[PDB]
């Protein structure tokens, strides 16, 4: 009825972001881990409705959308409460520009490192590229969040970039990558950032 | 001056025609500054990384290609350049990524591989089949996958203007698609950008 079928795979950072956002929206969605063997029938249907069996994929009776920037948008159309983006066009543009950067710098590389054919010398050069920009990235995410919250104190929306970066840190630890920072506060914030209840429920 | 926004464009660029077609549809007062017409020093001041087009306002500047037109649509709400029904809007937003990643690169490959003896000939044939095999798949709607003029039509018009200057012209052979091309070029927004 609220058919919503979400194709995912275990330990896939993309599927963890969409599942957490569906949880926050309280949306009716049926999660399908195509990795599990019993779900082989669903995977067949997945290669039918997507060009490359894209993971993850939000499937409804009407559509099948597969990019992360698209999936977050679509989810906002189907469930507007609570809002994931700010209200002002400037801030929304910056949130989008920032989502693209976090996807190409971290999300795409976290997926490269999980390849069993990736040469050791490349993997190590990938982890170092992510270590150089993670702190600077996190500072900008918080910077944009403080602005958007102050410009509309009554809007009371959620910062999807904060939700996405939480999973970056999580996968940093999962992959034994160092979060380079001796700042006591950033570690506290990251500490509380990984402690939010909706995030534990996702893992 | 007194213009609301200033759009620094670059010649023969679909990302520049996209912005112009949309800013015209919105009727936002714009000053258009062509690139190359600037001092090589100023070109680095507006866009430090030579990425065009650039859209400047009093308090804000933006040149991200994947998010520019979505900003013009949200910054100047009327007229809405996205579908009104949810299911239809969720799809157009996906076809935008499809167009940027599947159909715009083929334009660059017509410029880049104009260095191979018979590569262009093979590319015009592939693009032609890609359309004719789609002119039948799509029919019976005024504008691209919707009842009203959408961002997807700006994406496509700009791409059509740029291919048409590279020798690939849309004839009667594309029929359903050619009538869609004649309606697109009739609009004033797409017309100001084609001259
Ligand atoms: N596995 C996976 N990848 C995702 C997901 N969401 C976005 N991406 C990938 O990230 C790359 C670029 O992401 P974007 O932020 O959309 O930037 P772009 O549109 O300019 O390409 C793309 O790969 P690319 O190398 O640029 O090729 P292409 O997709 O542009 O054809 C895209 O496939 C996801 O949920 N799962
Ligand atoms: Mg791409």
Numbering used by the authors:
A (entry chain A): -2 to 200
B (entry chain C): 0 to 194
Reported in the publication:
An unusual set of Francisella regulators—the heteromeric macrophage growth locus protein A (MglA)–stringent starvation protein A (SspA) complex and the DNA-binding protein pathogenicity island gene regulator (PigR)—activates FPI transcription and thus is essential for virulence. The F. tularensis SspA protein, which shares ∼30% sequence identify with other bacterial SspAs, is not homodimeric and instead forms a complex with MglA. Multiple studies have shown that SspA proteins impart their function through interaction with RNA polymerase (RNAP), and, in Francisella, both MglA and SspA are required for RNAP interaction. Here we identify MglA–SspA as a novel ppGpp-binding complex and describe structures of apo- and ppGpp-bound MglA–SspA.
The structure was solved to 2.8 Å resolution and refined to final Rwork/Rfree values of 21.2%/26.5%. In each dimer, clear electron density was observed for a single ppGpp–Mg2+ molecule that, strikingly, binds in the open face of the heterodimer with a stoichiometry of one ppGpp to one MglA–SspA dimer. Comparison of the apo- and ppGpp-bound MglA–SspA structures showed that the individual subunits and the heterodimer did not undergo any large structural changes upon ppGpp binding (superimposition of the apo- and ppGpp-bound heterodimers gives RMSDs of 0.7–0.8 Å). The ppGpp in the (MglA–SspA)–ppGpp complex adopts a ring-like conformation, which is stabilized by a bound Mg2+. Binding of the Mg2+ to the phosphates is crucial for stabilizing the bound ring-like structure, which assumes a conformation optimal for docking in the MglA–SspA-binding pocket. The backbone amide group of MglA residue Leu65 and the carbonyl oxygen moiety of MglA residue Ile52 play key roles in guanine base recognition by making hydrogen bonds to the O6 and N7 atoms, respectively. Aside from the base-specific interactions with the guanine, additional hydrophilic and hydrophobic contacts anchor the ppGpp molecule into the binding pocket. These contacts include stacking interactions between MglA residue Tyr11 and the guanine base as well as ribose hydroxyl interactions from MglA residues Asn100 and Gln105. The ppGpp pyrophosphate moieties are contacted by the side chains of MglA residues Arg64 and Lys101. Intriguingly, SspA makes only two interactions with the bound ppGpp-Mg2+: one from residue Lys65 to the ppGpp phosphate groups and another from residue Asn100, which interacts with the Mg2+ ion.
